[PDB]
DNA sequence: ACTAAAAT
């Protein structure tokens, strides 16, 4: 049954290694891909999951991201105002995202106004990318159409003083 | 002589004005023993019978609060003794003017008393002091009739004064007691802290002999503002901007500068990616065009705070020098009362007449005549606080009779008065948005339509620039080159006098007639120095004072404490508190705080070792 | 010698 369960999760785009799938759920007489998804969305992706991001994505010779992907945010920083004033309405908001999946870390840039991802979004939040995503100079362009935000808290061990 | 009544005013000029208005031109003037106060006599009617009116004035406060003997000489009483065991009394201020004896001799034989004092909070205290002076010597009352009277007025116009005489009232003892409590509290706290500080630090740290270290509810917060600014300057680390700009040319020798919609980027790689996305391009498309009208608001009336701000920011004048010049102009008879915090013109005012008086000076004669011909505009509405009408010209001066500072202030006052009654300024702002590849830039410009108060206040003018070319959507243009610029964030600069005044006003520290005194005090005690640009720079001794106050007990250097104490004291005025029950508690809390401060002075002592 | 209020 896991043979078809893996295909189902791949078609959904939630790519994750089979050992991680087994760890997340181990045959309670049925795979129940739905509860597999719900349990995963509150699990740290560094431990569990396979490597699928294109190699040397942080360089400048890929220019394309095809198919759907699932990624985990780590740090969110507003590169539009100094660290002294974390939010000043003197320039439009502009967000840089440090995403990861497995072994490779990638950087993304807002490039529009997206209300789903805010400065208060805690790490560990899951992002699904659908369609074609552009890579310009090792930077992933995050249009409002090709984003989906799925929550989940794993370790919000972060404090702003 | 059947019956005479007596009237007391707080200024001799105001006394003469009211006497003239109510006496219908018939006066008998005489000079008193002081030499600065005059007595006016005239006949009239008060309460159904003919009455002789006698009008006089007193110069400001009459009594000030102080200590008795054996406690006003230091080195003989412990400072902690002053808090709740030192007898207190009232003694004359300005003893050269025998105000009490003058009041007694001029009120002897009077029957009724009417008080034309100011309507603010600091006026009813003078009211009750005058009663304490005059009531002992006066004809005793008959039956159950009321003798003491008070009048309420705002302006010095005919109708206002006559109506104020028509309707009368009574004073407020509960309102006077609040001011009395404030005076007692301030004197106790200041004399307690200053003595200990200047008796400890003077004899143990070398070059502070013959020096005074002072504490109070105003000087200390004023210093706190400046040292907070100094700390903010000292703890700033620069960052790096990255702004992207490009220029588009339509006709030969007609280029156009543009601005990025996203103003700043703080990542070098991100900025480089955006540049590489734009650099190799040759078209410029047009997205949208804008055309809206707008107005620049005419200035409000003139307050003392705004006078001081403009004097210190545009005329190179200290607050005390400005106040002295304004007072001299008032005494000579050229401008109205220069200590007011009301920014709303009185309903009854000869605005047209005052404007028509200044219809001959070559600097603004054309504008004055044009306004008189085409009809004036109503003033902008604003706050009212009783007190006195705003600062307006009264006579017509020239460059010759006045000189230097007086003329420099008079020009600004007259120009502000003319501007506050003129029209507004209308300008059209055109913004055109271009698109370069994946990014969009904008450029904006202004053009004037009908100048208003700008004709009298040129420094508030709208700058002139070449009009943006008219374009329709879909047009394409060539672009010269797209380049980047690197910039650094700039640290803040030291406080200016205008900024300090506007910080003082909002927090309640000081008042309309005490800001110059406090600033000059902290300048004279070598706490701050005035540098180029009229900027107040903290010195070593002041930095140590505040950095020690924060470490020892933080509410001393804290702007909100004065407001909190004032709010607590207003209960006495409102009739919902008890005088002793409030004063004793508020003195006890401060006594405990001082007794903690004296035993926790090692922390501040270990801070001057890194200096003198 | 202190403090904080009005006035000329
Ligand atoms: Mn007054
Ligand atoms: Mn006032």
């Amino acid at each position: 049954m896991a043979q078809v369960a893996g295909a189902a999760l791949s078609q959904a785009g939630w790519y994750l290694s089979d050992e991680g799938i087994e760890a997340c759920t181990s045959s309670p007489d049925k795979v129940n891909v739905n509860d597999i998804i719900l349990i995963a969305l509150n699990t740290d992706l560094r431990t569990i999951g396979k490597k699928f991001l294109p190699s040397d994505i942080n360089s400048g010779k890929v220019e394309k991201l095809e198919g759907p992907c699932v990624l985990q945010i780590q740090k969110i920083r507003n590169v539009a105002a100094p660290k002294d004033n974390e939010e000043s309405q003197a320039a439009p908001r502009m967000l840089r995202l440090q995403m990861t999946d497995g072994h490779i870390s990638c950087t993304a840039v807002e490039f529009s106004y997206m209300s789903k991802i805010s400065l208060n979004t805690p790490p560990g939040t899951k992002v699904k990318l659908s369609g074609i995503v552009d890579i310009k100079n090792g930077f992933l362009l995050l249009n409002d159409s090709n984003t989906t935000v799925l929550g989940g808290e794993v370790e919000h061990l972060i404090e702003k003083w | 002589v059947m019956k005479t009544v007596l009237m007391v005013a707080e200024k001799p000029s105001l006394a003469q004005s009211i006497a003239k208005i109510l006496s219908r031109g018939s006066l008998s003037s005489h000079k008193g023993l002081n030499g600065a106060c005059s007595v006016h006599e005239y006949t009239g009617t008060f309460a159904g019978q003919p009455v002789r009116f006698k009008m006089t004035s007193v110069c400001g406060h009459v009594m000030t609060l102080d200590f008795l003997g054996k406690y006003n000489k230091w080195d003989k009483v412990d400072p902690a003794e002053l808090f709740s065991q030192a007898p207190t009394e009232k003694k004359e201020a300005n003893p050269k003017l025998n105000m009490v004896k003058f009041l007694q001799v001029e009120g002897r034989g009077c029957d009724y008393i009417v008080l034309w004092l100011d309507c603010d909070k600091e006026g009813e205290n003078i009211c009750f002091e005058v009663l304490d002076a005059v009531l002992p010597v006066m004809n005793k009352a008959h039956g159950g009739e009321k003798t003491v009277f008070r009048a309420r007025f705002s302006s010095i116009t005919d109708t206002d004064i006559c109506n104020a005489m028509a309707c009368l009232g009574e004073p407020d003892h509960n309102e006077a007691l609040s001011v009395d409590a404030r005076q007692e509290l301030d004197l106790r706290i200041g004399c307690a802290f200053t003595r200990f500080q200047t008796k400890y630090f003077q004899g143990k740290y070398g070059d502070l002999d013959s020096s005074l270290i002072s504490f109070g509810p105003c000087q200390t917060p004023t210093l706190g503002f400046c040292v907070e600014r100094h700390d903010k300057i000292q703890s700033f680390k620069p960052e790096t901007y990255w702004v992207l700009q490009a220029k588009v040319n339509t006709d030969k020798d007609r280029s156009l500068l543009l601005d990025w919609d996203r103003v700043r980027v703080f990542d070098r790689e991100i900025a480089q990616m955006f540049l590489n996305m734009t650099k190799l391009e040759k078209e410029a498309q047009v997205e949208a065009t804008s055309r809206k009208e707008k107005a620049k608001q005419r200035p409000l009336a003139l307050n003392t705070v705004e006078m001081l701000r403009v004097a210190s920011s545009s005329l190179g004048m200290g607050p005390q020098h400005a106040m002295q010049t304004a007072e001299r102009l008032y005494t000579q008879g050229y401008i109205s009362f220069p200590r007011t915090e009301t920014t709303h013109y009185p309903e009854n005012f000869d605005l047209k007449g005052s404007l028509r008086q200044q219809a001959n000076h070559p600097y603004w004669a054309d504008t004055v005549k044009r306004l008189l011909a085409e009809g004036i505009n109503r003033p902008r509405k604003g706050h009212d606080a009783g007190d006195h009408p705003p600062i307006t010209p009264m006579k017509s001066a020239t460059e010759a009779e006045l000189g230097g500072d007086a003329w420099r202030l008079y020009e600004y006052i007259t120009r502000h008065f003319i501007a506050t009654v003129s029209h507004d300024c209308k300008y059209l702002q055109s913004t055109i948005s271009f698109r370069i590849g994946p990014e969009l830039f904008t450029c904006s410009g202004k053009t004037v339509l009908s100048p208003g108060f700008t004709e009298v206040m040129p420094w508030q003018s709208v700058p002139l620039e070449e009009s943006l070319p008219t374009c329709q959507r879909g047009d394409a243009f060539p672009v010269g080159e797209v380049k980047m610029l690197e910039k650094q964030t700039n640290p803040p600069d030291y406080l200016t006098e205008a900024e300090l005044i506007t910080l003082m006003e909002k927090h309640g520290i000081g008042t309309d007639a005490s800001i110059p005194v406090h600033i000059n005090n902290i300048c004279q005690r070598n706490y701050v120095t005035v540098e180029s640009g009229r900027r107040l720079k903290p010195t070593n001794l002041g930095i140590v004072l505040v950095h020690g106050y924060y470490k020892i007990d933080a509410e001393l250097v804290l702007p909100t404490i004065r407001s909190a104490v004032e709010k607590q004291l207003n209960l006495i005025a409102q009739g919902k508190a008890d005088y002793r029950q409030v004063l004793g508690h508020t003195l006890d809390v401060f006594k405990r705080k001082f007794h903690y401060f004296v035993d926790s002075i090692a922390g501040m002592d270990e801070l001057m070792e890194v200096s003198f």
Side-chain angles (χ1 to χ4, degrees):
Chain A
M1 187 66 204
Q3 200 254 332
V4 189
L9 61 83
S10 69
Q11 271 287 105
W14 189 270
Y15 291 119
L16 188 153
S17 46
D18 75 277
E19 196 274 330
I21 286 307
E22 294 293 328
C24 185
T25 316
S26 291
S27 166
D29 208 4
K30 186 65 173 66
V31 290
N32 189 359
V33 287
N34 290 318
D35 74 25
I36 297 169
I37 290 168
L38 278 71
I39 298 170
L41 276 296
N42 260 315
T43 53
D44 179 73
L45 190 63
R46 194 161 311 91
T47 61
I48 62 170
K50 70 173 293 303
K51 171 197 293 183
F52 85 104
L53 272 297
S55 66
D56 293 345
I57 190 167
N58 285 320
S59 85
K61 45 185 182 295
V62 74
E63 299 287 329
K64 182 64 69 177
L65 187 48
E66 56 172 0
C69 312
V70 182
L71 294 174
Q72 199 184 206
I73 320 182
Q74 288 199 174
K75 292 183 184 293
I76 297 169
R77 180 182 167 327
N78 180 3
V79 60
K83 311 201 148 180
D84 185 66
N85 313 322
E86 273 291 326
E87 185 75 26
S88 291
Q89 280 90 16
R93 216 195 60 187
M94 171 145 188
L95 277 296
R96 184 171 50 110
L97 273 69
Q98 282 74 241
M99 288 182 210
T100 178
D101 194 336
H103 301 84
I104 297 89
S105 177
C106 61
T107 47
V109 55
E110 214 174 359
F111 202 55
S112 68
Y113 185 86
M114 294 182 286
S115 70
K116 314 322 291 293
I117 296 178
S118 89
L119 201 167
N120 302 343
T121 295
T125 308
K126 261 68 174 175
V127 176
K128 189 164 90 70
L129 299 186
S130 65
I132 301 299
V133 190
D134 284 345
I135 296 89
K136 181 69 176 177
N137 261 25
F139 286 102
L140 265 70
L141 280 149
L142 271 192
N143 279 3
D144 209 341
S145 81
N146 46 26
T147 59
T148 300
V149 176
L150 304 100
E153 195 261 332
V154 298
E155 273 188 21
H156 182 74
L157 183 63
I158 171 166
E159 311 66 19
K160 204 254 185 179
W161 274 268
Chain B
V1 183
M2 271 315 98
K3 262 162 91 164
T4 61
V5 296
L6 186 149
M7 317 202 192
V8 172
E10 184 177 288
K11 275 82 80 147
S13 309
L14 187 149
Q16 190 215 17
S17 278
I18 296 171
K20 182 175 174 66
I21 301 299
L22 300 161
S23 52
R24 283 156 174 200
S26 57
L27 287 79
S28 169
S29 294
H30 171 66
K31 298 291 180 68
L33 62 90
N34 296 50
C37 295
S38 45
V39 54
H40 313 251
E41 282 191 54
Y42 63 103
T43 186
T45 187
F46 188 78
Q49 287 71 240
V51 176
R52 310 187 33 90
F53 288 4
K54 205 195 287 191
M55 181 95 178
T56 186
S57 48
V58 303
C59 278
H61 265 260
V62 189
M63 305 271 201
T64 175
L65 189 62
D66 212 2
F67 285 132
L68 278 193
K70 180 67 174 66
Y71 291 178
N72 216 353
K73 268 212 159 194
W74 315 1
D75 291 331
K76 292 263 182 196
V77 304
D78 304 77
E81 261 295 358
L82 290 66
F83 271 117
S84 173
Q85 205 155 344
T88 314
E89 94 277 5
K90 295 200 151 158
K91 70 180 183 63
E92 310 202 48
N94 296 115
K96 185 183 287 185
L97 294 174
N98 301 329
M99 220 59 81
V100 177
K101 185 177 180 180
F102 172 48
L103 265 165
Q104 281 171 284
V105 68
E106 213 66 64
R108 186 179 295 276
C110 294
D111 192 359
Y112 297 154
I113 178 168
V114 179
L115 294 174
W116 290 82
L117 275 66
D118 284 352
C119 302
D120 63 36
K121 204 143 91 163
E122 295 290 328
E124 294 189 87
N125 218 2
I126 310 175
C127 174
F128 270 102
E129 190 277 332
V130 170
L131 276 296
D132 291 331
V134 179
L135 288 174
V137 306
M138 219 166 84
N139 283 115
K140 68 181 178 67
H142 186 287
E145 61 86 20
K146 42 186 74 175
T147 290
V148 190
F149 284 137
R150 187 177 164 73
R152 296 221 159 252
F153 65 96
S154 74
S155 66
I156 302 299
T157 78
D158 268 16
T159 61
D160 220 351
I161 290 300
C162 183
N163 298 6
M165 182 75 258
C167 182
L168 293 182
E170 299 290 328
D172 291 331
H173 206 191
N174 297 25
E175 181 56 299
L177 283 191
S178 73
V179 186
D180 186 74
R182 203 271 317 287
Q183 262 183 312
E184 190 146 316
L185 186 66
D186 279 7
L187 187 153
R188 288 266 174 84
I189 300 313
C191 295
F193 271 77
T194 301
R195 277 186 194 171
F196 166 68
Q197 271 200 140
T198 193
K199 206 169 140 53
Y200 180 44
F201 280 3
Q202 183 158 355
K204 292 313 277 147
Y205 261 75
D207 63 358
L208 280 72
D209 60 11
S210 185
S211 173
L212 206 66
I213 302 188
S214 185
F215 168 87
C218 312
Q219 301 175 1
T220 300
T222 310
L223 199 155
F225 285 143
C226 300
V227 290
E228 158 165 27
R229 184 50 80 84
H230 166 263
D231 307 353
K232 206 161 299 311
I233 297 169
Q234 201 55 69
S235 83
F236 174 108
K237 300 294 187 291
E239 291 256 20
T240 315
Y241 280 7
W242 274 286
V243 190
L244 175 53
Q245 84 194 5
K247 65 179 73 175
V248 65
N249 45 1
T250 80
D251 186 74
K252 302 312 187 311
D253 296 331
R254 193 251 293 272
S255 51
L256 183 62
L257 188 144
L258 294 174
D259 303 333
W260 205 9
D261 58 343
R262 298 189 265 250
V263 176
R264 307 179 284 199
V265 163
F266 285 10
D267 205 303
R268 188 167 168 76
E269 303 280 348
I270 288 282
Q272 181 60 37
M273 161 295 289
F274 269 116
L275 183 63
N276 290 318
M277 185 180 288
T278 300
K279 179 168 82 210
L280 277 296
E281 212 176 315
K282 293 179 179 179
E283 293 293 328
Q285 276 207 23
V286 179
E287 202 262 328
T289 315
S290 294
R291 194 101 71 211
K292 277 74 69 177
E293 296 189 356
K294 266 166 178 148
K296 267 181 85 84
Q297 284 299 324
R298 47 187 186 280
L300 305 97
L302 183 63
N303 266 338
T304 181
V305 159
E306 210 274 340
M307 185 180 288
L308 290 177
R309 266 217 289 280
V310 174
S312 179
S313 190
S314 305
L315 300 184
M317 292 215 168
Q320 200 166 50
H321 204 43
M323 208 49 97
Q324 263 193 2
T325 318
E327 179 74 35
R328 201 166 293 172
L329 274 178
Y330 168 47
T331 305
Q332 268 178 261
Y334 285 159
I335 63 185
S336 76
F337 182 76
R339 282 175 290 274
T340 79
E341 68 275 78
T342 61
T343 180
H344 176 228
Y345 283 109
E347 203 75 13
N348 318 113
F349 208 68
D350 45 355
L351 268 175
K352 213 183 275 190
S354 286
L355 197 146
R356 203 190 302 110
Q357 210 152 341
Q358 279 160 341
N360 271 19
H361 200 305
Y363 278 39
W364 43 75
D366 277 3
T367 311
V368 170
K369 292 181 181 179
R370 274 181 31 61
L371 267 70
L372 294 174
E374 293 179 353
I376 80 180
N377 188 11
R378 289 321 298 121
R380 200 164 133 203
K381 216 183 72 63
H383 190 229
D384 195 344
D387 274 297
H388 326 282
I391 301 142
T392 61
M394 311 215 78
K395 274 203 220 181
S396 71
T398 46
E399 201 56 50
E401 63 182 2
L402 292 172
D405 44 352
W407 183 251
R408 297 251 299 287
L409 216 50
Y410 189 78
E411 265 198 358
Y412 175 66
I413 286 176
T414 300
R415 278 174 143 86
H416 204 105
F417 174 80
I418 287 184
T420 199
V421 75
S422 195
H423 285 221
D424 276 349
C425 182
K426 290 182 90 168
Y427 65 101
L428 73 164
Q429 163 163 29
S430 309
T431 80
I432 176 171
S433 308
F434 293 100
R435 184 161 284 246
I436 306 297
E439 292 94 345
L440 61 84
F441 303 88
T442 59
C443 65
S444 53
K446 317 192 177 169
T447 316
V448 294
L449 281 189
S450 70
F453 57 96
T454 296
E455 203 169 319
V456 187
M457 301 195 78
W459 49 94
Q460 287 213 8
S461 177
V462 165
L464 61 83
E465 51 285 357
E466 181 40 36
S467 164
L468 277 296
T470 81
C471 295
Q472 53 154 310
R473 173 153 184 182
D475 291 331
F477 285 148
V479 289
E481 200 272 336
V482 190
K483 44 202 291 293
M484 293 177 70
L485 291 204
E486 284 196 346
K487 293 164 173 291
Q488 302 222 346
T489 312
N490 296 332
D493 186 74
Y494 297 96
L495 280 174
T496 82
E497 271 161 46
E499 299 207 344
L500 194 65
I501 288 189
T502 187
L503 268 173
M504 261 185 180
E505 182 65 26
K506 67 182 290 294
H507 277 280
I509 291 287
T511 67
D512 63 24
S514 71
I515 295 157
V517 180
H518 301 297
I519 289 189
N520 195 87
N521 267 5
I522 75 164
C523 294
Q524 291 274 350
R525 307 252 195 280
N526 284 3
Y527 284 174
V528 292
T529 46
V530 294
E531 281 274 9
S532 71
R534 298 305 301 196
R535 311 180 304 178
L536 295 146
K537 159 163 188 262
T539 196
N540 261 307
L541 194 153
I543 279 171
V544 296
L545 283 169
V546 160
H547 271 194
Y549 278 159
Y550 273 140
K551 190 198 284 321
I552 298 315
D553 189 358
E555 66 88 20
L556 299 198
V557 297
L558 185 63
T560 60
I561 301 299
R562 178 77 145 159
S563 296
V565 176
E566 197 261 331
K567 182 174 72 68
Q568 187 63 39
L569 294 174
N570 218 51
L571 293 198
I572 314 176
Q574 279 177 55
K576 307 187 289 183
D578 207 347
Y579 184 39
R580 286 202 258 277
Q581 209 81 13
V582 166
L583 204 59
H585 192 247
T586 313
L587 270 175
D588 208 359
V589 64
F590 269 109
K591 183 223 281 203
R592 214 160 310 131
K593 205 170 281 303
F594 174 84
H595 205 78
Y596 175 47
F597 178 82
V598 66
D599 303 328
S600 178
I601 203 64
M604 187 180 168
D605 197 9
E606 61 94 23
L607 184 63
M608 271 185 217
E609 294 293 328
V610 298
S611 300
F612 63 88

